[PDB]
């Protein structure tokens, strides 16, 4: 009952392979830190920790396959897949969007439903809608934020926290 | 720190996909 990163592929992997729903993905956003000399102030940023993909035009195809190739370098690409992939490049500083309000206030936010997301005012929230998800979470940990996200509409469940609370650490 | 986050997730990502 005290984690740390060597186990947090396996625990992502367990969140949802062992859950009852349909969840196509698991993220962990890890806290990092930028000090700013202007005011001196060291702000929370949180960014890629890691992550599980669970999963299910020509010229946008084309543009994903060379991308996916050329990452392969150093067949279709869905969409979810490439909202997984265009995730880890994304960063959030405290108090500020979906994972940024989660984090700061020590929230569980769920957003079950397309409406639910496009109201959020949060934009990753929206982007996720665009790439065909409906239901996306963010519950905040002692080191992090995980999120999940699914394409289909989810409610809220027990058993699902139950194992949130098993595989992340809490203050 | 971040970029080996990042290429450690995508390392993975990209062998499952070949599956």
């Not at chain 1, 949802?16 to 729903?21: K, L, P, Q, T, V």
């Not at chain 1, 543009?63 to 992939?85: G, M, P, Q």
């Amino acid at each position: 009952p005290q984690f740390n990163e060597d186990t947090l592929q396996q625990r992502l992997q367990a969140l949802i392979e062992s859950a009852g729903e349909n969840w196509t993905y698991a993220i962990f956003w890890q806290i990092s830190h930028d000090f700013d000399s202007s005011t001196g102030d060291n702000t929370v940023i949180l960014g890629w920790g890691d992550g599980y993909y669970k999963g299910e035009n020509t010229a946008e195809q084309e543009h994903r396959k060379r991308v996916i190739r050329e990452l392969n370098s150093l067949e279709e690409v869905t969409d979810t897949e490439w909202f997984f992939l265009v995730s880890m490049t994304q960063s959030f500083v405290n108090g500020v969007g979906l994972p940024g309000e989660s984090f700061l206030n020590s929230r569980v936010i769920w957003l079950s439903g397309s409406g639910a997301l496009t109201g959020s005012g949060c934009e990753r929230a929206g982007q996720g809608q665009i790439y065909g998800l409906k239901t996306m979470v963010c519950i905040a940990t002692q080191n992090g934020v995980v999120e999940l996200g699914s394409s289909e509409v989810i409610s809220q469940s027990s058993d699902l926290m139950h194992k949130v609370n098993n595989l992340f650490n809490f203050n | 720190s971040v970029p080996q986050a990042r290429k450690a997730s995508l390392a993975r990502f990209l062998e499952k996909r070949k599956e």
